[PDB]
C-alpha cells in the first residue's frame, strides 16, 4: 500500500487520464494558508538549514550522500555525487538556500538526513508551470523505515508552497503514484575489463575477454572535427539551439539564458558541454556530467566513472553520429561507462552504438498536477 502517497494530491494507481487533461489536483491554492511552522521531527531530531556554499556543511552533504544514497538492485554501486556536483545542481539561478533542507540527530550533531529542491520552470503539455524540482532525499541508513521521509516530503513542500509553487517534478528508480513516464537506462561500455572485474558487465561462454575489448573499441577521431568545450561566449547559441529543439517534448524544462550558463557551462569532473559553432552559430551540442558509483566490497577498485548523457542536439550530422562522438568524448575525459536514458531520441541509437540495456529504469512524477502518461521519447528533460 501507500499509505503516505495517497494522502497527496497524486494520482491514485489506477488513473487514467485523456490527453486534453493538463491541470493541478488542487487548484486555488493560496500562500496565506500555507503552515508556519515546521513539521514536527521526532524526538532529539531537530531541522538545520544546510548552506551549500559553505564548504563544510557541503561536506557534511556529501558525507551523508556517499555513505547512504541509491544503489542498484544488487547493492554493488552506490551512486557517489561529488561535493562539487552537489555546489552546481543546488545553487541554480534563484536557487533558495531555505528549500536545502537537513535533519540531525541533536546528540551527535551529526547530520542524518536531507531533502532539497530548486525552482524551475516546466513545460508539461504545452503548458508552463513554475516548479520544483526535488532531488537529494537521504535518510541515514540506521534510520530506515521509520518515516521520516514523509516528515522531508511534507516539510520542503509547506517551504516550497510559501513561495507561491505547487507543482514539482521529480525521479525515482522506485515506482510509486503514478509515474507520467518511465524510462530504462542503458549503458555503453568504454573500459572493459574494468566493467567485467567489477561485476558491472559480464563475459559469456561466446565473448571472451580480447573479444568484449575489440567489440567495445572506438575510433579516436570525431564525426563532427570542430566539437569543442562549450565558453562563455557560446551561451546564447547554446539557448537558442537547445530551446528551440526542446519544444517538440511533452515535458521539457524552459530555460533561461541564465540556466544555459549554470547548466552547461563546464566544470571539471562535473559537467562536460561541447559545441560545434559554424559561423558564429552554434549548430550542435553534446552534454554529459560525472556521476562516479562507489563500488562496494571490490578489493582493487573503490571508484567506477561512469558520464550520464544530459542533452544532446544535430543539426549538422546524424543523431547516430552526434551519440558516438558523445561516446568518444566521455572516452577521452577517462570515464569507463556513458550512461543515457531512453529519452528524447536516444533510444534509436542505442542497438547501433552497442549500448546494453540495464537492469534499472527511472520514473518520471510531478506532484499535484493531472495530465495523460506517456512513452518516455516524448519526454524531453533529464534530471540529475
Ligand atoms: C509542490 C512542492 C512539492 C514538493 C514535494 C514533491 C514530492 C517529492 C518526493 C520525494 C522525491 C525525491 C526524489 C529523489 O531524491 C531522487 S530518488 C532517490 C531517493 N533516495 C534514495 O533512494 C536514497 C537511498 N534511500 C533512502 O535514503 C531512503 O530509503 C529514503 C529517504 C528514500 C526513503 O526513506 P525510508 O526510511 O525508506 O522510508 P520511510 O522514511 O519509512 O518513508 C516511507 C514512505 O516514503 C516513500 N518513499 C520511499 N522512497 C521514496 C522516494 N524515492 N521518493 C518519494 N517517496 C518515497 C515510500 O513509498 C513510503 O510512503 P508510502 O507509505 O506512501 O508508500
Ligand atoms: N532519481 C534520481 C537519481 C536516483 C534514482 C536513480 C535510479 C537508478 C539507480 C541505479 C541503477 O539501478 N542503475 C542501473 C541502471 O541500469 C545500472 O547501473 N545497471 C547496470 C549495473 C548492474 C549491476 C548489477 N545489478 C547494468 O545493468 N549494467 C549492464 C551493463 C552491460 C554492458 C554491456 C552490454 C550489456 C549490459
Ligand atoms: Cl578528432
Ligand atoms: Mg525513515
Given at each position: 500500500?501507500?499509505?503516505?502517497?495517497?494522502?497527496?494530491?497524486?494520482?491514485?494507481?489506477?488513473?487514467?487520464?485523456?490527453?486534453?487533461?493538463?491541470?493541478?489536483?488542487?487548484?486555488?491554492?493560496?500562500?496565506?494558508?500555507?503552515?508556519?511552522?515546521?513539521?514536527?521531527?521526532?524526538?532529539?531530531?531537530?531541522?538545520?538549514?544546510?548552506?551549500?556554499?559553505?564548504?563544510?556543511?557541503?561536506?557534511?552533504?556529501?558525507?551523508?550522500?556517499?555513505?547512504?544514497?541509491?544503489?542498484?538492485?544488487?547493492?554493488?554501486?552506490?551512486?557517489?555525487?561529488?561535493?562539487?556536483?552537489?555546489?552546481?545542481?543546488?545553487?541554480?539561478?534563484?536557487?533558495?538556500?531555505?528549500?536545502?533542507?537537513?535533519?540531525?540527530?541533536?546528540?551527535?550533531?551529526?547530520?542524518?538526513?536531507?531533502?532539497?529542491?530548486?525552482?524551475?520552470?516546466?513545460?508539461?503539455?504545452?503548458?508552463?508551470?513554475?516548479?520544483?524540482?526535488?532531488?537529494?532525499?537521504?535518510?541515514?541508513?540506521?534510520?530506515?523505515?521509520?518515516?521520516?521521509?514523509?516528515?522531508?516530503?511534507?516539510?520542503?513542500?509547506?517551504?516550497?508552497?510559501?513561495?507561491?509553487?505547487?507543482?514539482?517534478?521529480?525521479?525515482?528508480?522506485?515506482?510509486?503514484?503514478?509515474?507520467?513516464?518511465?524510462?530504462?537506462?542503458?549503458?555503453?561500455?568504454?573500459?572493459?575489463?574494468?566493467?567485467?572485474?567489477?561485476?558491472?558487465?559480464?563475459?559469456?561462454?561466446?565473448?571472451?575477454?580480447?573479444?568484449?575489448?575489440?567489440?567495445?573499441?572506438?575510433?579516436?577521431?570525431?564525426?563532427?572535427?570542430?566539437?569543442?568545450?562549450?565558453?562563455?561566449?557560446?551561451?546564447?547559441?547554446?539557448?537558442?539551439?537547445?530551446?528551440?529543439?526542446?519544444?517538440?517534448?511533452?515535458?521539457?524544462?524552459?530555460?533561461?539564458?541564465?540556466?544555459?550558463?549554470?547548466?552547461?557551462?563546464?566544470?571539471?569532473?562535473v559537467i562536460y558541454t561541447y559545441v560545434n559553432e559554424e559561423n558564429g552559430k552554434i549548430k550542435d551540442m553534446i552534454s554529459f556530467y560525472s556521476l562516479p558509483?562507489?563500488?562496494?566490497?571490490?578489493?582493487?577498485?573503490?571508484?567506477?566513472?561512469?558520464?550520464?548523457?544530459?542533452?544532446?542536439?544535430?543539426?549538422?550530422a546524424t543523431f547516430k553520429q552526434l551519440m558516438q562522438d558523445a561516446i568518444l568524448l566521455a572516452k577521452r575525459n577517462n570515464?569507463?561507462?556513458?550512461?543515457?536514458?531512453?529519452?528524447?531520441?536516444?533510444?534509436?541509437?542505442?542497438?547501433?552504438?552497442?549500448?546494453?540495456?540495464?537492469?534499472?529504469?527511472?520514473?518520471?512524477?510531478?506532484?499535484?498536477?493531472?495530465?495523460?502518461?506517456?512513452?518516455?521519447?516524448?519526454?524531453?528533460?533529464?534530471?540529475?
Open positions: 500500500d501507500y499509505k503516505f502517497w495517497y494522502t497527496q494530491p497524486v494520482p491514485k494507481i489506477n488513473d487514467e487520464f485523456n490527453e486534453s487533461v493538463n491541470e493541478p489536483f488542487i487548484s486555488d491554492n493560496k500562500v496565506e494558508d500555507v503552515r508556519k511552522d515546521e513539521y514536527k521531527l521526532p524526538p532529539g531530531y531537530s531541522w538545520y538549514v544546510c548552506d551549500v556554499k559553505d564548504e563544510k556543511d557541503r561536506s557534511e552533504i556529501y558525507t551523508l550522500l556517499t555513505d547512504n544514497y541509491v544503489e542498484d538492485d544488487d547493492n554493488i554501486f552506490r551512486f557517489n555525487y561529488s561535493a562539487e556536483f552537489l555546489l552546481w545542481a543546488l545553487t541554480s539561478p534563484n536557487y533558495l538556500k531555505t528549500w536545502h533542507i537537513g535533519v540531525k540527530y541533536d546528540a551527535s550533531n551529526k547530520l542524518i538526513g536531507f531533502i532539497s529542491a530548486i525552482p524551475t520552470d516546466i513545460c508539461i503539455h504545452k503548458r508552463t508551470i513554475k516548479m520544483a524540482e526535488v532531488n537529494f532525499l537521504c535518510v541515514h541508513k540506521t534510520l530506515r523505515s521509520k518515516r521520516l521521509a514523509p516528515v522531508l516530503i511534507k516539510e520542503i513542500t509547506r517551504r516550497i508552497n510559501l513561495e507561491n509553487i505547487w507543482q514539482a517534478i521529480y525521479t525515482a528508480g522506485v515506482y510509486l503514484p503514478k509515474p507520467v513516464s518511465d524510462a530504462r537506462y542503458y549503458h555503453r561500455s568504454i573500459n572493459v575489463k574494468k566493467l567485467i572485474e567489477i561485476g558491472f558487465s559480464s563475459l559469456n561462454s561466446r565473448l571472451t575477454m580480447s573479444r568484449a575489448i575489440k567489440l567495445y573499441r572506438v575510433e579516436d577521431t570525431l564525426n563532427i572535427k570542430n566539437m569543442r568545450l562549450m565558453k562563455k561566449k557560446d551561451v546564447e547559441g547554446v539557448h537558442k539551439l537547445l530551446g528551440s529543439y526542446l519544444e517538440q517534448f511533452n515535458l521539457y524544462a524552459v530555460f533561461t539564458k541564465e540556466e544555459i550558463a549554470h547548466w552547461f557551462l563546464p566544470i571539471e569532473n558509483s562507489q563500488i562496494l566490497g571490490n578489493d582493487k577498485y573503490s571508484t567506477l566513472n561512469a558520464a550520464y548523457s544530459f542533452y544532446n542536439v544535430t543539426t549538422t570515464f569507463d561507462v556513458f550512461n543515457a536514458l531512453e529519452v528524447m531520441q536516444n533510444k534509436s541509437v542505442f542497438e547501433d552504438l552497442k549500448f546494453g540495456e540495464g537492469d534499472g529504469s527511472l520514473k518520471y512524477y510531478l506532484y499535484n498536477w493531472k495530465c495523460a502518461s506517456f512513452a518516455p521519447a516524448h519526454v524531453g528533460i533529464v534530471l540529475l
